A paper describes a structure:
The copper- and zinc-containing superoxide dismutase 1 (SOD1) possesses four cysteine residues. The active and stable SOD1 is a homodimer stabilised by an intramolecular disulphide bond between cys57 and cys146 and metal sites bridged by histidine residues that are loaded with Cu and Zn. SOD1 possesses two additional free cysteine residues cys6 and cys111, is mostly distributed in cytoplasm and is responsible for converting toxic reactive superoxide into oxygen and hydrogen peroxide preventing oxidative stress within the cells. Extensive efforts have established that it is not the functional loss of SOD's enzymatic activity that is responsible for the ALS causing properties, but destabilisation of dimer caused by mutations or loss of metals in the metal site that leads to aggregation properties which are the disease causing agents.
In North America, half of sod1-related fALS cases arise from mutation of Ala4 to Val, with one of the most severe forms of fALS with the shortest survival time. One of the binding sites within SOD1 structure focused as a drug target is cys111, which is a solvent-exposed residue at the dimer interface that is vulnerable to oxidative modification giving rise to aggregation. Ebselen is an organo-selenium compound that scavenges reactive oxygen species and enhances cellular defence from oxidative damage. Furthermore, ebselen exhibits covalent binding at cys111 without impeding interaction between SOD1 and hCCS indicating greater potential over other compounds to be developed as an effective neuroprotective drug. Ebselen, a synthetic organo-selenium drug with potent anti-oxidant and cytoprotective effects, is considered to be a potential template for developing therapeutic molecules that can stabilise dimers of ALS-causing SOD1 mutant via binding to cysteine 111 which could reduce aggregation and delay disease progression. A new higher diffracting form of small molecule-bound A4V SOD1 crystals has been established allowing us to visualise ligand pose of the compounds targeting cys111 in the pathogenic target enabling lead optimisation through structure-based approaches. We elucidated binding modes of compounds at the dimer interface of SOD1 mutant by high resolution crystal structures which are beneficial for describing structure-activity relationship. We show that ebselen clearly replicates neuroprotective activity in vivo by delaying disease onset in G93A SOD1 transgenic mice, which is the representative mouse model for SOD1-linked ALS.
Residue numbers in the entry:
A (entry chain AAA), B (entry chain BBB): 1 to 153
Write the structure that this text describes.
Amino acid sequence: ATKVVCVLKGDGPVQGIINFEQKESNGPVKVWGSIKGLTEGLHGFHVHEFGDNTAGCTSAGPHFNPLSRKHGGPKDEERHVGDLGNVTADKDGVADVSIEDSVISLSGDHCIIGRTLVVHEKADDLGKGGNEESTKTGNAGSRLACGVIGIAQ
Amino acid sequence: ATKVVCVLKGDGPVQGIINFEQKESNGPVKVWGSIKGLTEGLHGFHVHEFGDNTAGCTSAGPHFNPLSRKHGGPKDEERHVGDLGNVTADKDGVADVSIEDSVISLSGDHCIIGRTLVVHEKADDLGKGGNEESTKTGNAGSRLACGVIGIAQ
Ligand SMILES: *[Se]c1ccccc1C(=O)Nc1ccccc1
Ligand SMILES: *[Se]c1ccccc1C(=O)Nc1ccccc1
Ligand SMILES: [Cl-]
Ligand SMILES: [Cl-]
Ligand SMILES: [Zn+2]
Ligand SMILES: [Zn+2]
């Protein structure tokens, strides 16, 4: 019943389209789409705080963390709202994304509209990496592609 | 107090950065920035309904019009929320944008976050073109660049 979309763009080309749908404001968000141009394996997948792509993906700032928690994986209670874990690219460099998440929302103070979706260079260690960066960024490395999360029809 | 930003990109040379600031939710929104790569003269400048760039600036849909009005200019009572008139490009193809608008907002029903800002091929006739299309689009022609309006620091 609310529909949101993000077009991911970066050098490669790394490029993707991610759709978000929420039936009800108290319900989960379905996240689906595809990303191409990736290296085979895990890629950290996060909502970042700012929908600011003026200087590319760096402008997006840190993970979206409205509740001031540590970084974790999507299944963790201790996570940032923006912690969507990893997407997985096949040998052809395509990640087919299929996520259901209870913590992001398309309304209220967990709302992700106007924020940035980022796909990262490396795996997100989901806060289990055992260094200070693990519980902040998950050590997922550079930002390969991003886009501002927008309202869809 | 609320800051939002939009990076305009398209299929051609046109690129720009637009900033929006709103001190108070009941106050005007200051709009400032720059668009480069334009032909000299007037170019329509609108907030479109969808923050959807799936197939480029076409996917942004029609002018943002939550109050079901006809198309006009920004100083008109009869306007779409998204009707920000024209920007003007100089001999070098640079439009220095400086708008203050009382109808757009960065909160509430007129909120433009997660919508698309579009700069057009031709002048917007501000609903004074003398044909039916004038009262819908202002006859501003194709979409040269666009971007989703995102939350800034
Ligand atoms: Se959603 C979303 C995204 C960006 C900015 C504001 C919101 C929003 O809906 N806020 C809100 C609406 C109603 C009640 C609380 C918060
Ligand atoms: Se602002 C904003 C941006 C994106 C989606 C929703 C909103 C929003 O705050 N909606 C809203 C809140 C309160 C009253 C009307 C509308
Ligand atoms: Cl990061
Ligand atoms: Cl149009
Ligand atoms: Zn995080
Ligand atoms: Zn209009």
